[PDB]
From Swiss-Prot:
Gene name per UniProt: BAZ2B
Domain Bromo positions: 9-113
Subunit structure: Component of the BRF-1 ISWI chromatin remodeling complex, at least composed of SMARCA1 and BAZ2B, which regulates the spacing of histone octamers on the DNA template to facilitate access to DNA. Within the BRF-1 ISWI chromatin remodeling complex interacts with SMARCA1; the interaction is direct. Component of the BRF-5 ISWI chromatin remodeling complex, at least composed of SMARCA5/SNF2H and BAZ2B, which regulates the spacing of histone octamers on the DNA template to facilitate access to DNA.
Primary role: Regulatory subunit of the ATP-dependent BRF-1 and BRF-5 ISWI chromatin remodeling complexes, which form ordered nucleosome arrays on chromatin and facilitate access to DNA during DNA-templated processes such as DNA replication, transcription, and repair. Both complexes regulate the spacing of nucleosomes along the chromatin and have the ability to slide mononucleosomes to the center of a DNA template. The BRF-1 ISWI chromatin remodeling complex has a lower ATP hydrolysis rate than the BRF-5 ISWI chromatin remodeling complex.
Tissue: Expressed at varying levels in several tissues, whereas a smaller transcript was expressed specifically in testis.
Disulfide bonds: none
Similarity annotation: Belongs to the WAL family.
Record protein name field: Bromodomain adjacent to zinc finger domain protein 2B
Compartments where found: Nucleus
Amino acid sequence: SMSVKKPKRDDSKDLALCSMILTEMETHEDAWPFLLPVNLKLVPGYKKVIKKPMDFSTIREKLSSGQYPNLETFALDVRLVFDNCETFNEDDSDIGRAGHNMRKYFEKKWTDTFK
């Protein structure tokens, strides 16, 4: 509350560390469905159904331009990529499997880097 603060967690490396995680997601072999924004002209249903499209390239641009106020808003966008994927893709599809794999991969890196 006012004039009553928990001890200050060192957040000075978060930016660099989120960039590293994101590089690791970018270079994973199952990243291909997620690297670029879904083409809303060419994929029927996507525009209407997915209210907040997100992709790795869009996260990278936001990250690089100081549009994440903190590491939680970064994790929310990453998770959004996978939540969108689950919304639109059957579990038993290449893309559906890709999303589950990437989510797992991300969640481990996140925990190992920050928790």
